[PDB]
Design a protein around this ligand. Structure first.
Ligand SMILES: Nc1nc2c(ncn2[C@@H]2O[C@H](COP(=O)(O)OP(=O)(O)O)[C@@H](O)[C@H]2O)c(=O)[nH]1
Length: 323
């Protein structure tokens, strides 16, 4: 099956760049930007400019309306890259211009072509200020209209799960790491020879029209690794305000070190089912984690929530109308 990952804007491009560096296989990678200089810095195989006319290649100046116009003017370029595609991940850092503005356009284009359309969207760190968060949430409201499922990851939650960072560079490197794990978790159980593969048809039934999606990951080592990893994953969502135990459809990836047999999946899936919604439809795959030993990582993508709401800091977020 044909999977593409498209980074939109600087943050999205950087995340996809990390996925390339992390060795994502069996998928085609693209970076789309209005900022031609940023594109020039990337290792991503396919670099695509949008908005030459309106931006002259100098970026969107953090204005979502400009990112939107860039994508609309060059919608032919976007359609071209989307031809012959089963699934696309649209990776964007919400809160800037290009990602915020163009991501909904690209997502809509893909979804109208019948491609399974999964946005992977971040909300900014608190250190980025109130205005970037406002812009992000406004853009998210458009992106949700355009997507099958939209995975929303709040950068402040990421911050919590790793070591204190001392440079903005390192803060974002951890964001890239997490996004890369989230996406590679899904692609690798479909398009590589995995420990337990899942059919693309199952990924589609799990995520199609899923809406708001929330990820949680947890590592387990040693004798009780299953219980430990599942507990950590269910209790560590990357977005507050909608517990994973409420989702009606879930996609679980169990990363295993080479020394762990596949039947660890038995205990994992028992534990997940005990913790989450009794009626949840859950698909799961398993894939090797290199350089690890006596190790699993349970990565849970939860979707199809009763209410498409969430919390960021002290703000409870609800959108105007859920399709
Ligand atoms: N994952 C990741 N996110 C980033 C990075 N740099 C910035 N961001 C996030 O992306 C959001 C938008 O910034 P950016 O993508 O540069 O703006 P755009 O190019 O106009 O879309 C920011 O508010 C950050 O939260 C990065 O290197 N990696």
């Amino acid at each position: 099956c044909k999977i593409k990952v498209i980074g939109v804007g600087g943050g999205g491009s950087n995340a996809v760049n990390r996925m390339y560096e992390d060795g994502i296989e069996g998928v085609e990678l693209y970076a789309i930007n209005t900022d031609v200089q940023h594109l020039s810095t990337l290792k991503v195989p396919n670099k695509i400019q949008i908005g030459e006319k309106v931006t002259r290649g100098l970026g969107a100046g953090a204005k979502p309306e400009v990112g939107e116009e860039a994508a609309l003017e060059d919608i032919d370029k976007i359609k071209e890259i989307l031809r012959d595609t089963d699934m696309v991940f649209i990776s964007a850092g919400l809160g800037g211009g290009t990602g915020t503005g163009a991501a909904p356009v690209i997502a809509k284009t893909a979804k109208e072509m019948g491609i399974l359309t999964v946005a992977v969207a971040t909300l900014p760190f608190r250190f980025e200020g109130p205005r970037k968060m406002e812009k992000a949430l406004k853009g998210l409201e458009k992106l949700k209209e355009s997507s099958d499922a939209y995975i929303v990851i709040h950068n402040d939650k990421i911050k919590e799960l790793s070591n204190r960072t001392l440079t903005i560079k390192d803060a974002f490197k951890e964001v890239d790491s997490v996004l890369s794990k989230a996406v590679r978790g899904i692609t690798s159980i479909v398009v590589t020879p995995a420990v337990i593969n899942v059919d693309f048809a199952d990924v589609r039934t799990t995520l199609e029209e899923g809406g708001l999606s929330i990820i949680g990951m947890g590592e387990g080592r040693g004798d009780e690794k299953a219980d430990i990893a599942v507990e950590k994953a269910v209790t560590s969502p990357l977005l507050e305000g909608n517990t994973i135990e409420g989702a009606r459809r879930l996609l679980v990836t169990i990363w295993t070190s080479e020394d762990i047999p596949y039947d660890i999946v038995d205990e994992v899936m028992e534990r997940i089912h005990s913790k989450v919604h009794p009626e949840a439809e859950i698909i799961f795959g398993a894939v090797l984690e290199p350089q690890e030993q006596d190790f699993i990582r349970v990565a849970i993508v939860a979707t199809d929530f009763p209410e498409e709401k969430f919390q960021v800091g002290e703000k409870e977020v609800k959108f105007k109308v859920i399709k």
